[PDB]
C-alpha cells in the first residue's frame, strides 16, 4: 500500500 511506499522513500539513501 502507500504506507510501504512511504517507508521505502524515507529509507532511500541513493
Amino acid at each position: 500500500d502507500f504506507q510501504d511506499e512511504l517507508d521505502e522513500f524515507f529509507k532511500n539513501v541513493s
Partner: antibody
Amino acid sequence: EVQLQQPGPVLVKPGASVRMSCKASGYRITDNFMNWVKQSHGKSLEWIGIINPYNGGTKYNQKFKGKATLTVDTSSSTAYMELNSLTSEDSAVYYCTRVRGNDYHGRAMDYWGQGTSVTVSS
Amino acid sequence: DVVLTQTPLSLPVNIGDQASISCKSTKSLLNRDGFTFLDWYLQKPGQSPQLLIYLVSNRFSGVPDRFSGSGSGTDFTLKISRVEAEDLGVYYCFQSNYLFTFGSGTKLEIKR
C-alpha cells in the same frame, strides 16, 4: 538555531506560475527531508509534498500532483515550491517545514517557516 | 486518504482546568517496524504551526510538561493538565503513516 526563511507576501495573476523559496539555516539542508504545507484563509492545514534534499526525491499529495513541483538547490541551502496554472483556489499561505527524521526520531515537522502568503488576482 | 476526525472542534476551557482533544483515524497507523507517526501541532493566532508532541507521546523540546499525548492504533488523545492563558490556539493532529493528513483542528478558547 534552526531557521527556515520564506519571502514575504506575493501577488500573482491567474494562470501564471509562482516559485517560492525557503532558506534553511543553522543546519545542513541535506540532513533533513522538508514538507510543504498549505493553509487557506480560515481553513485547516493541508500537506502538499515532501522532498529529500540529499537526492531530490519527492512524494506528493495526489491533489497537488501536477500543481506543485518541489525542488532544492543544495549549494545555497534553499528549497523551492513551484505552483503552475494559478487560480483563485491557490490563494493561501504556504509553509516549508523540516522533518525530524524517520522511525523513532519521528516524522514530525519540528521547525516551520513563517509562511509565504499568495494572492492570485487579476 | 486517512481522515483524522478530532473531537471536540470547539473547546472552551477555564484557566487551571484540564482539557482533552480526541483524534480518531479511519485507518490503523502502524508501519512494518511498529511506528505510529501521529503528531500534535499548535497554531497560535498569527503564527506558524509549532510542534507539540511527536510519535504519539514524545514531547518536543521546549514544550511544557503540561502537554501529554496517549493512544494506540486508531484512537489518540492530547491532554493539557493545567491550562494557561497563552495556550489559546488551534490544535491539529497529523499522521505520516499513509499520505500525510491533518485533522480539522480544535479551537481552544479561554473561559474568563
